[PDB]
Design a protein around this motif. Structure first.
Motif, PDB file in Angstrom:
ATOM      1  N   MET A 159       0.848  -1.181   0.000  1.00  0.00           N
ATOM      2  CA  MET A 159       0.000   0.000   0.000  1.00  0.00           C
ATOM      3  C   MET A 159       0.887   1.234   0.000  1.00  0.00           C
ATOM      4  SD  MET A 159      -2.931   1.257   2.794  1.00  0.00           S
ATOM      5  CE  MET A 159      -3.035  -0.462   3.278  1.00  0.00           C
ATOM      6  N   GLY A 160       0.374   2.316  -0.572  1.00  0.00           N
ATOM      7  CA  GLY A 160       1.114   3.555  -0.613  1.00  0.00           C
ATOM      8  C   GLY A 160       2.135   3.588  -1.734  1.00  0.00           C
ATOM      9  N   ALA A 161       3.001   4.599  -1.660  1.00  0.00           N
ATOM     10  CA  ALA A 161       4.010   4.798  -2.693  1.00  0.00           C
ATOM     11  C   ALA A 161       4.985   3.635  -2.788  1.00  0.00           C
ATOM     12  CB  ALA A 161       4.776   6.092  -2.430  1.00  0.00           C
ATOM     13  N   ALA A 162       5.137   2.847  -1.721  1.00  0.00           N
ATOM     14  CA  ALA A 162       6.017   1.686  -1.791  1.00  0.00           C
ATOM     15  C   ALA A 162       5.520   0.690  -2.830  1.00  0.00           C
ATOM     16  CB  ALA A 162       6.120   1.023  -0.419  1.00  0.00           C
ATOM     17  N   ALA A 163       4.203   0.484  -2.894  1.00  0.00           N
ATOM     18  CA  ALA A 163       3.645  -0.398  -3.910  1.00  0.00           C
ATOM     19  C   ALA A 163       3.938   0.124  -5.310  1.00  0.00           C
ATOM     20  CB  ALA A 163       2.140  -0.551  -3.700  1.00  0.00           C
ATOM     21  N   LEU A 164       3.797   1.435  -5.517  1.00  0.00           N
ATOM     22  CA  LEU A 164       4.085   2.007  -6.829  1.00  0.00           C
ATOM     23  C   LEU A 164       5.554   1.848  -7.189  1.00  0.00           C
ATOM     24  CD1 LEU A 164       2.118   5.351  -7.265  1.00  0.00           C
ATOM     25  CD2 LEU A 164       1.834   3.258  -8.568  1.00  0.00           C
ATOM     26  N   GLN A 165       6.448   2.049  -6.220  1.00  0.00           N
ATOM     27  CA  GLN A 165       7.870   1.868  -6.489  1.00  0.00           C
ATOM     28  C   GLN A 165       8.175   0.425  -6.855  1.00  0.00           C
ATOM     29  OE1 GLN A 165      10.596   2.878  -3.290  1.00  0.00           O
ATOM     30  NE2 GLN A 165      11.851   4.105  -4.688  1.00  0.00           N
ATOM     31  N   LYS A 166       7.576  -0.527  -6.137  1.00  0.00           N
ATOM     32  CA  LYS A 166       7.767  -1.932  -6.476  1.00  0.00           C
ATOM     33  C   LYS A 166       7.243  -2.231  -7.874  1.00  0.00           C
ATOM     34  CE  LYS A 166       6.481  -4.838  -3.238  1.00  0.00           C
ATOM     35  NZ  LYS A 166       7.712  -5.669  -3.338  1.00  0.00           N
ATOM     36  N   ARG A 167       6.090  -1.661  -8.226  1.00  0.00           N
ATOM     37  CA  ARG A 167       5.504  -1.914  -9.537  1.00  0.00           C
ATOM     38  C   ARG A 167       6.387  -1.358 -10.649  1.00  0.00           C
ATOM     39  NH1 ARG A 167       2.878  -5.810 -12.053  1.00  0.00           N
ATOM     40  NH2 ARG A 167       4.877  -5.502 -13.123  1.00  0.00           N
ATOM     41  N   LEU A 168       6.779  -0.087 -10.536  1.00  0.00           N
ATOM     42  CA  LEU A 168       7.632   0.521 -11.552  1.00  0.00           C
ATOM     43  C   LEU A 168       8.999  -0.143 -11.629  1.00  0.00           C
ATOM     44  CD1 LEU A 168       6.850   4.297 -10.937  1.00  0.00           C
ATOM     45  CD2 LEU A 168       5.882   2.811 -12.681  1.00  0.00           C
ATOM     46  N   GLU A 169       9.512  -0.661 -10.513  1.00  0.00           N
ATOM     47  CA  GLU A 169      10.790  -1.360 -10.549  1.00  0.00           C
ATOM     48  C   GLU A 169      10.709  -2.591 -11.444  1.00  0.00           C
ATOM     49  OE1 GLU A 169      13.931  -1.682  -9.559  1.00  0.00           O
ATOM     50  OE2 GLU A 169      14.357  -0.289  -7.920  1.00  0.00           O
ATOM     51  N   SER A 170       9.622  -3.352 -11.330  1.00  0.00           N
ATOM     52  CA  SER A 170       9.410  -4.551 -12.128  1.00  0.00           C
ATOM     53  C   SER A 170       8.592  -4.297 -13.388  1.00  0.00           C
ATOM     54  CB  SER A 170       8.718  -5.623 -11.282  1.00  0.00           C
ATOM     55  OG  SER A 170       7.466  -5.163 -10.807  1.00  0.00           O
ATOM     56  N   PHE A 171       8.183  -3.056 -13.640  1.00  0.00           N
ATOM     57  CA  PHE A 171       7.402  -2.754 -14.832  1.00  0.00           C
ATOM     58  C   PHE A 171       8.231  -2.995 -16.087  1.00  0.00           C
ATOM     59  CE2 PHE A 171       5.204   0.264 -17.765  1.00  0.00           C
ATOM     60  CZ  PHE A 171       3.958  -0.322 -17.711  1.00  0.00           C
ATOM     61  N   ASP A 172       7.625  -3.661 -17.065  1.00  0.00           N
ATOM     62  CA  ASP A 172       8.261  -3.979 -18.343  1.00  0.00           C
ATOM     63  C   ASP A 172       7.539  -3.175 -19.419  1.00  0.00           C
ATOM     64  OD1 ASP A 172       9.387  -5.705 -16.566  1.00  0.00           O
ATOM     65  OD2 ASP A 172       8.848  -7.549 -17.625  1.00  0.00           O
ATOM     66  N   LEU A 173       8.108  -2.019 -19.769  1.00  0.00           N
ATOM     67  CA  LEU A 173       7.447  -1.107 -20.696  1.00  0.00           C
ATOM     68  C   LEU A 173       7.556  -1.556 -22.148  1.00  0.00           C
ATOM     69  CD1 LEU A 173       9.693   2.113 -20.919  1.00  0.00           C
ATOM     70  CD2 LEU A 173      10.487  -0.248 -20.742  1.00  0.00           C
TER      71      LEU A 173
END
Length: 48
Positions: A13-27
């Motif tokens: 939850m929070g910005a930590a979730a977004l950081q985890k998502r963008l870290e593993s995001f495959d654009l």
DNA sequence: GGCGACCCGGCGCCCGCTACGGAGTCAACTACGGGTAGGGGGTATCGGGCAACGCGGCACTGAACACCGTTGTCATGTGCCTTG
């Protein structure tokens, strides 16, 4: 969801979730799939 | 189930400078404990004040030699007079 079963889905939850998502995001695959959608698509979905 | 209005949010701006006023504001407490910081007390270290004393030009010391200059001086050479 956590108690009935674990070690399968990771959540946060929070910005930590977004950081985890963008870290593993495959654009690259997202870009490829969106190119495919643009090739065969209609409506405002095309603009999105 | 994408179109569609419409709805709503959400935002974006909104000539120029000088020059031209102030104003300033409502709800705990004490006990301890340390540590820093101040004060004076005393102490090692650095900085300021004076005549010899370094120098140097020359100067005196003339003393003691030197440099011409001089009238000392000598033994030894011309000119006249007396005798061979």
């Amino acid at each position: 969801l956590r108690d009935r079963f674990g070690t399968y889905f990771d959540g946060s939850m929070g910005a930590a979730a977004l950081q985890k998502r963008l870290e593993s995001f495959d654009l690259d695959e997202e870009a490829e799939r969106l190119r495919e959608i643009i090739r065969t698509g209609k409506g405002q979905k095309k603009t999105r």
